[PDB]
Structure 1
Amino acid sequence: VQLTEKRMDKVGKYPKELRKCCEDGMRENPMRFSCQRRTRFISLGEACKKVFLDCCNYITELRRQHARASHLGLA
């Protein structure tokens, strides 16, 4: 989808040493965990967690918007 496009550009906005944190935050969520919950045991600093959390909340909203658009036959 064009969400891949929105993700690629989302990752690029961060310093290179924090990009993987953003990528991991935007992975699929089959266990239906909250973004906060998904940070609890990776336990990597204040920087990586914060980036993980932002990108997670970012992609989560995008997924819902895409789901609504698909449901309404707009996308």
Structure 2
Amino acid sequence: SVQLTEKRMDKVGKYPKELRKCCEDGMRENPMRFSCQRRTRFISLGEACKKVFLDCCNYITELRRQHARASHLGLAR
């Protein structure tokens, strides 16, 4: 979303330069409505990369939900 793209960049920045792809992919849209843990199960690609993915996924999932709630309540930022 609007300010969501922002908090994503800030989050991706927080990580060592070679774990940013993992973070980025952890925060892509979720049309199949899979849990964060479920989406890691077949990426392989590493242990330290799964921790990153999972952490960024959980981070952005919470932010999307908070955003959906604000939007539903007409507080929409």
Between the aligned residues of both structures, percent identity stands at: 100
1:23-61, CA deviations, whole angstroms, 9 ceiling, x for partnerless residues?
A: 000000000000000001111211100000000000000
Report the alpha carbon displacement of residue 11 of structure 1 after superposing the two structures with TM. 0.1
Query: Which residue in the other structure is 1:14 paired with?
Result: 15
What runs of 5+ residues in structure 1 fail to find an aligned partner?
none
Segments ≥4 residues shifted beyond 2 Å: none
TM-score by length of 2: 0.96
Q: Aligned-pair RMSD on alpha carbons?
A: 0.4
Could you tell me which residue of structure 2 aligns to residue 47 of structure 1? 48
Match of 2:69 in 1: 68
Q: Distance in 2 between matches of 1:44 and 1:56?
A: 16
Task: Provide the rounded CA distance (Å) in 1 between the counterparts of 2:46 and 2:28.
Answer: 20
